[PDB]
Design a protein around this ligand. Structure first.
Ligand code: 76J
Ligand code: ZN
Ligand code: ZN
Ligand code: ZN
Length: 234
C-alpha cells in the first residue's frame, strides 16, 4: 500500500490527517525514550589505531566483554567516539519504514540490507511498577477492544507499549521471525531493543516472535505465512 519514514511520525497534525486518509497508521503518542510513571565497567578492548580502523577492524566489536554481556560502553571507553557498542545512547537504529501489509495492518520493513545482529529500534513505552501494572491489567480487562503489549525489564519495571511507544509498535508477529528482543544495560538502566537474527534484505518485513513478550488473553489468527506457522498468536 503506502509507506512512511520515521520523520512522518514527528508531525502530529500532518500524521492525524494522513491516518484519516488511510495513508498513515492510526495516531498514538510517540516517545523516543522510555517514560517512567514513578520516580524510582570498562571493557578490556585495545583502543584501535587509525591504520586498524581503516583496515576494517571493529572498535568494541564481537569480542568486547561489555558487548558479550549486553552492556553498552560509557563515554569513558578506550575506543572513545569510534566505539560501535553505544547504539542505544547514540540512537543508531536501522533504516526502517512503515508499510501497509495485505492482512496484518501496518508493518515495519528494512529500507536497507540489515546484517545479522543489527540494532533495529528500541522497544519504547511507559515503564510501570508492580502497582501501576496491576491497575493497568485491571483497566485493560474492561476496555476489551484494547490490545495490550508488555515487556518485563525486571520485577518492579514493566514496559507498557499499549498507549505510548515508537515505531516498534508496527513490528508484526512471525512464527519464523527475523528479529528478537535483547535486554541491554545502558548507563545502569535496563533497555530492550529489537535485533535482527539473520541478514534481512532491503524491502523485507521485520518480524518477531510475540511469545517473548506479555500480551492478550485473546489469540489472533496468524497470517505470518511461515512453513512452520503455529496458526495463532495468543
Ligand atoms: C511492541 C511490539 C508489539 C506491539 C504490537 N504490534 C501490533 C502490530 C501493529 C499492527 N499491525 C498495526 O497495524 O498497527 C500487534 C497487532 O498486529 C496484528 N498482527 C501482528 N502480527 C500478526 C500476524 N502474524 N497475523 C495476524 N495479525 C498480526 C494483530 O492485530 C496484533 O494484535
Ligand atoms: Zn570493548
Ligand atoms: Zn566500547
Ligand atoms: Zn504464523
Amino acid at each position: 500500500g503506502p509507506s512512511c519514514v520515521m520523520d512522518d511520525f514527528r508531525d502530529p497534525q500532518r500524521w492525524k490527517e494522513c491516518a484519516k486518509q488511510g495513508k498513515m497508521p492510526c495516531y498514538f503518542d510517540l516517545i523516543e525514550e522510555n517514560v517512567y510513571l514513578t520516580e524510582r565497567m570498562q571493557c578490556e578492548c585495545t583502543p584501535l589505531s587509525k591504520d586498524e580502523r581503516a583496515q576494517g577492524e571493529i572498535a568494541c566489536g564481537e569480542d568486547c566483554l561489555n558487548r558479550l554481556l549486553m552492556i553498552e560502553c560509557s563515554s569513558r571507553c578506550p575506543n572513545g567516539d569510534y566505539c560501535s557498542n553505544r547504539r542505544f545512547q547514540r540512537k543508531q537504529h536501522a533504516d526502517v519504514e512503515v508499510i501497509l501489509t495485505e492482512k496484518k495492518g501496518w508493518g515495519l520493513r528494512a529500507a536497507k540490507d540489515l546484517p545479522s545482529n543489527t540494532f533495529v529500534l528500541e522497544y519504547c513505552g511507559e515503564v510501570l511498577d508492580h502497582k501501576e501494572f496491576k491497575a493497568r491489567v485491571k483497566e485493560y480487562a474492561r476496555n476489551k477492544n484494547i490490545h495490550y503489549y508488555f515487556m518485563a525489564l525486571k520485577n518492579d519495571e514493566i514496559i507498557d507499549a499499549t498507549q505510548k511507544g515508537n515505531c516498534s509498535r508496527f513490528m508484526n508477529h512471525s512464527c519464523e521471525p527475523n528479529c528478537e528482543t535483547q535486554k541491554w544495560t545502558v548507563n545502569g538502566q535496563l533497555r530492550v531493543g529489537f535485533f535482527t537474527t539473520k541478514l534481512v534484505p532491503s524491502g523485507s518485513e521485520l518480524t518477531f516472535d510475540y511469545q517473548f513478550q506479555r500480551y492478550g488473553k485473546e489469540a489472533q489468527k496468524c497470517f505470518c505465512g511461515s512453513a512452520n506457522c503455529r496458526g495463532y498468536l495468543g
